Amino acid sequence: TKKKLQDLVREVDPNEQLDEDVEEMLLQIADDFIESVVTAACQLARHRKSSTLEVKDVQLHLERQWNMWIPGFG
C-alpha cells in the first residue's frame, strides 16, 4: 500500500538492504513498542482522577523516559 518497510529505509540511507528475517523482527519491535506505550498511557489515564481520558498532554510527560519529544502541539 504505502510505506511498508522499504521507503523508511530510503528515508535514512538510500543504499541499504535488509534480510527477509530481519523485517518481521522490526515489526515485532514496533508491536512491542505500541503495547508498552498504550499500556503506560492507560496507566496514566487511570491516574488523573481514577480515570479521565487518553490525553496527548500526559503522553508528553510519559516520553521523558524514552528521551524523545514529539513535534506536535503539546
Partner: protein, 119 residues
Amino acid sequence: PKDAQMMAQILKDMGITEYEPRVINQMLEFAFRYVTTILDDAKIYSSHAKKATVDADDVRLAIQCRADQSFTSPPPRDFLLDIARQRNQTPLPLIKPYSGPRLPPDRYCLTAPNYRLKS
C-alpha cells in the same frame, strides 16, 4: 553509626563474615541516592497532579516506573520454555570421524586481514 551495624548484620545474614569498611558507606550513599531520586519523581508526579500536597499513590506509580527500566531480570519460567519449544524441532548433525574436533568454516572465524592495509 546505627546504619553501620545493621548493614553488617545484613551482610552477615547472607553468609559473609569478612568485608571492607568502605562498602558500608557505599550502600548508605546508594540508599540516599535511591530515595532522593524517587522523591524527585514524586515531586514531578505531584506537580503534574495539580495538587498542593503530596499523595501516597504518586509514590506507588513512581516506584513502579523505577523498577520498570532501572532494574534487570530475565523472564522466568515461561519465556525460556517457549524458546526450547520453538527450537525442539531442530535436528542434530551427523558425526563424521575424520580427525576429531573440526572448526567452523573459514570466513566465519576471527582470521581475516584488513582490506585497506597491504604489503
